[PDB]
Amino acid sequence: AEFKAGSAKKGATLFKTRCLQCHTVEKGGPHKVGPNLHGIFGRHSGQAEGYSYTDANIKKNVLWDENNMSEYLTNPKKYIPGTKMAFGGLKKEKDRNDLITYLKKATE
Numbered sequence: 001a002e003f004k005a006g007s008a009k010k011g012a013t014l015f016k017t018r019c020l021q022c023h024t025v026e027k028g029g030p031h032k033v034g035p036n037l038h039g040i041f042g043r044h045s046g047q048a049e050g051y052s053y054t055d056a057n058i059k060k061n062v063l064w065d066e067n068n069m070s071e072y073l074t075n076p077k078k079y080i081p082g083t084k085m086a087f088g089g090l091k092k093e094k095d096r097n098d099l100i101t102y103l104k105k106a107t108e
C-alpha cells in the first residue's frame with residue numbers, strides 16, 4: 001500500500017467531482033459538511049481548528065501522510081469505523097495517487 005506521484009490535473013478533477021461538495025482546500029477556507037483540509041499533510045486526524053469531529057476520527061490517532069491518506073480513501077468507514085464522512089471510497093490506486101498528488105499541492 002504505497003504512494004507514487006501521479007497527475008495533479010487528474011486529481012483536481014477527482015477532487016471537484018468527489019470531495020469539493022463537502023470540503024475546501026484554501027487557507028482560511030470555510031468548514032462545510034466536512035472540515036477544510038488546508039495543512040492536512042503533517043497533521044493528525046481530528047485537529048482542524050473549529051470543526052466538531054466524531055470521536056472515531058479523533059480516537060483513530062494517525063498522521064495524515066500519503067500512505068495513510070490513500071488507505072483512508074480506499075474505504076473511509078473501514079479505516080475509521082463510525083466516521084460520519086459519507087463517502088464509499090476510490091478503489092483504483094492510480095486515482096488515489098493522482099488525488100493525493102493534487103491535494104498535497106492544493107492544501108499546503
Ligand code: HEC
Pocket residue numbers: 014015018019020021022023033034035040044045046047048052053054055056057064073082083084085086087099
Ligand atoms: C460529505 C458528503 C463528504 C464527502 C463527499 C467527502 N468528505 Fe471527507 N469528510 C467529511 C466529514 C463529515 C468528515 C469528518 C470525519 C468525522 O467523522 O468526524 C470528513 C473527514 C475527512 C478527512 C479527515 C480529516 C481530519 O481528520 O482532520 C479527510 C482527510 C477527508 N475527509 C478527505 C476527503 C476526500 C479526499 C474526499 C474525496 C475524494 C472526501 N473527503 C469526500 C465529509 C465528506
